[PDB]
Amino acid sequence: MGSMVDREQLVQKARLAEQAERYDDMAAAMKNVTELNEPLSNEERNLLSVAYKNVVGARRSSWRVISSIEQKTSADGNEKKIEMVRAYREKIEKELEAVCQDVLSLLDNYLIKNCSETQYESKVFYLKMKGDYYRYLAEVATGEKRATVVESSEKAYSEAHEISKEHMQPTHPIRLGLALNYSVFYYEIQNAPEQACHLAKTAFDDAIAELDTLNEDSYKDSTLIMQLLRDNLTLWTS
Amino acid sequence: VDREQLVQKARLAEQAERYDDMAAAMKNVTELNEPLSNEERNLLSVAYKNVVGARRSSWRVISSIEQKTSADGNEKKIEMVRAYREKIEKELEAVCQDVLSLLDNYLIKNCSETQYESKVFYLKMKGDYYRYLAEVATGEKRATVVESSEKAYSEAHEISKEHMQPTHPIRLGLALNYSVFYYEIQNAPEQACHLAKTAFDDAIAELDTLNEDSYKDSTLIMQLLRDNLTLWTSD
């Protein structure tokens, strides 16, 4: 494939787009790179994640503002104004669903599929992504549609977890990131704070015990995520 | 989708930080062909200021890179950055042609003789957006837009010194942006500083004329004119 399109120019464009803070361009470049069907370098894997996290993140942020407005607005009872806002919230939802769908397709049909059992970190990374984006779908879903995304997020986090227990140090940033977000899933989506705290604590303690397993490359990222785990732990606890 | 709904959407869009939506909403309001209220006019200005501003920011970062990497000298990496810059440029110029068009065909054309605040506001906008064009243009292209920016700034200047008070925020803002045109675009620091100081000192002279409604707007701009003079003189 790469014989047809220059793969390295595409990644360069993505780096470029990141610096101009043009994240649609960035995701577009990384989608294309993925589609060449080669496996993704650790950097490329980050570029991909950052691009889509900012593209979906912008919609999330706008949705939360518009949702909050709908609650106050409804309170008034002004028909026309409420419908304005609900319509607008829906426009943003549909952009959000479309970005999640783009990511999930990429994950299932390119990223997850391609990597080996031996490549263990890639598998957890992408499986966590799949968890996150079903979680993003879950945040704006209702009724049946919601249960299905929640279950899907669950399934994807649950498998990401099993693979990390068995094959990753409790201090690995990815295994730590996974524990973070999975706990967030339990608190925010499942409204199950008992599980949330348990998972966030279990992960934090296990990390602390093995504090020897940190290298010069890990200590920055492992400890920063261990703090977040704790920050959520403290909070939810109160 | 009547006029009051459009403005409601512009407001929502702003909360959402969705500035293209907000620009599109106020563009539809402008095209209803009636004058804009002060609220509406600020909504319009804010929308397009963020829309174009996102591009201006991008372009600078990309432009900065072109210079630094032209050194490394790879002739296909140089070519790509140049392309990316040009992609951004054409978006930015398109936003500016769009605003300018609203200005010449609707907003400016629709002022009555006695709507001086409005004219100074719209001529300063016209001034601003030809300036945005000048930041990315070169050669005769630059000369042409720089001339246009000047021509608009200058007419706003004269209407404002005859019909508005030194403490008026639209007049003060004109001075600040116009002083910037002199500094950044025409590269005339002396003529910049004179314009910034005169507007500041004139405002101080008549500080008593600040009304309760806009003293916050006027005072912040006065703060900026100073920050500018400090920076520009200090070098």
Binding site: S49, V50, K53, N181, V184, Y187, E188 | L176, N177, N228
Partner: peptide
């Protein structure tokens, strides 16, 4: 220059 003008993992 001036002219008038509960977390999850982070990128």
């Amino acid at each position: 220059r001036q002219s008038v003008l509960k977390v999850s993992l982070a990128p």
